[PDB]
Amino acid sequence: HWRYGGDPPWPRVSPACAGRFQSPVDIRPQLAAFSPALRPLELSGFQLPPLPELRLRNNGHSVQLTLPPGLEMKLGPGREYRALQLHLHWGAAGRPGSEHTVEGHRFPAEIHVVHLSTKYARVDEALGRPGGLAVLAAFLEEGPEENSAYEQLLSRLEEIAEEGSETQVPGLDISALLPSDFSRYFQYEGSLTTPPCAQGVIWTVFNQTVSLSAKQLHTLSDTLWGPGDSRLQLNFRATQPLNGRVIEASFPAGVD
Template sequence: MPPCGRERSIAELLRGTPRRGRCREPDPASGLGSPRCSLTEPGPGHSHWSYEDREHWGVGYPDCAGTMQSPINIDTAKTIFSPQLRPIQLSGYSLPASEKLKLRNNGHTVLLELPETLAITGGYAQQYRAVQLHLHWGSPSGPGSEHTVNGHRFAAEIHVVHYNTKYDSVTEAMVYPDGLAVLGAFLEVGPRENPYYQEILQHLHKIQTEGKEVLVPGFNIAGLLPANMKFYFHYNGSLTTPPCYQTVKWTVFNQTMQLSHSQMSTLVMNLRNDDGKPLQNNYRLVQDLHRRQVLASFQTTLLSPKQTPSGSDASEAAEGHSGSSFHAGDVLAVLFGVLFAVTALAFLLYIYKHRSQNTRMDSPTKSKVIYTAASTENTA
């Protein structure tokens, strides 16, 4: 497949504005030269790549064959604890219902445009402005997150795309190594409906075909991300769709988000791609780490190999999040619990023994005598 440009500017692509056009030479506005011709991760529009063809993206988009690609498998045993990684802080994420946002099916994903007033103000060395968010999912028969943790693939994944405020626009930012920041979180099936995701999912039936869009009322966008923003993984990677630019500083949260079974079905079953086929399995396979390191903002060494950062505990879900990361505090709590139990048992045994000795005496008076005698002895 030859490199294929489109009759639209990179800025339009970044916003995900759909516009069909004939193939032509790569857009000079990108300043990137052939064959970087479409941008789909920060704002996927209809373009000529497909997930069925994902093994061959490197042919038309050379960066896709690079050595800093995303997604990756996060091997928690090999992550490096970095105490300098501070909690991610967001500002402006709570939007009033009066602010309408564009929600679009672009043939590759469902994409929600975000106002630039949303920003990451902590956790990164620089400030980043939001551009859009979108989701990756599987099919009724399998999960579809892009990143995996210890080989485990989650049901789905959310990506919130931002660009560095030191650049004038996302178009400019996206070609620099520190240009983009994407916040990623895993979605799992839990016991109850997630009201934040419902703000998106309830509109999917209106945008079933590729290119359709709908205006949705603003809501608290931060509710789509984990409550715990202290625990995350961090690494340098790329857009996970062509043109796969290697300019993304990734944050993948340890805590997962939960959607009801019905909500997950709505996500997986509602949309269609440009061929009119069900839009499913819109995830890229994990890429080689090469020489990269994955940092962790927390100590993962107590995670056993089979543990994942997921959790489905009902009480945790009640708080709107979940996570099974196992920490030193938990170990201490268990130790103290065991100590308490042993002490209590020893005390009960002592009481029991003492009482049974007393009951061996035929009458309480006798025991009284013994008691008196003992006290006499003591005073002597």
């Protein structure tokens, strides 16, 4: 496979990673285009019952939770999606590791919930098509309290610490891993943030963060191993030039 930071650049092996409209990006809210057509996000089916369980796996680049069929997400008219999986990006002891930044600010970690457009039956058909995939992204920051929803996942990392290992977790309310404010977000068109870096992905970044305790953020960043005998840390791609793309905001943003 490929690696974060290490190895030689990605375009050597995956030339699409040198495309012009890549993710992640630095969001500057005062320069985002206010778009009142961007209405509150709509999710359904995200409150899962305890059974069947969900697969949780350390793939060497992140921890990835496989979602069951039936999770629906709507960005707007004509833009309906089904959720496939969620995974995270983080830093290290101290160091933040979100993928997107806000005015150059990097947050402790970031969650990505990846979705397939209802236009397509299979991910392979949607790759590279405009709108074929959509990601919901939220920043994770340090709060004073244990976050109970995340603890359901974070308490299971120790058992998948080795690269390639997997476990099963009870169904949970996936929407409780996301912010409560569905009305304020940024949206733009970019790419997958790992090879093959396919373009056409609609990114929606919540303005509101989710809060984890310090211990929880330490558990996320320090438990897993990656390729070789290396710790799975700092698993974020550098931000990419906008190259003339306009980031939209669903709310009046970046004032004072």
